[PDB]
Amino acid sequence: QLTEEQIAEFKEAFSLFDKDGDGTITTKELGTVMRSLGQNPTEAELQDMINEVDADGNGTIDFPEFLTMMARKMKDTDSEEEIREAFRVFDKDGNGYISAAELRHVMTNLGEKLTDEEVDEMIREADIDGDGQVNYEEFVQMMTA
């Protein structure tokens, strides 16, 4: 079941998207996050993304809506191409391994300000074989329902 700490984790994630902290994610903020990950969505695609999860139809995503759709999405596994694309966002040098520094780099680009300890903690949890890095196979497991 959903725990308190998991809720706080999702709340942290919501704050990543909610740049101005006004309690809602707009198409503008979603576009901002996507571009910082190197993706180039259109205005129409951003509207459609939000429409899919905007339960009250008001044009923006609040925390309950964010929590609802994210918890649902975690119960699904995305296609290999979708996962492989996400992996390349992190594996910048393309060597097949996500290092702490590469994770630091993405999180920084997202505007988040993590400590070296916090990043290592993330790597450690995703790491399976214990080499201190995340390969594609481990990345796939992490994203697997």
């Binding site: 998991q6 984790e9 990950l37 969505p41 993304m49 994210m70 975690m74 995703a126």
Partner: peptide
Amino acid sequence: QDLLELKSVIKLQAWWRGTMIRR
């Protein structure tokens, strides 16, 4: 740590892909 912050941004890719229209 359940990596839900990291997992949330990764979920964006498939979320976006599902709405794409070719130019």
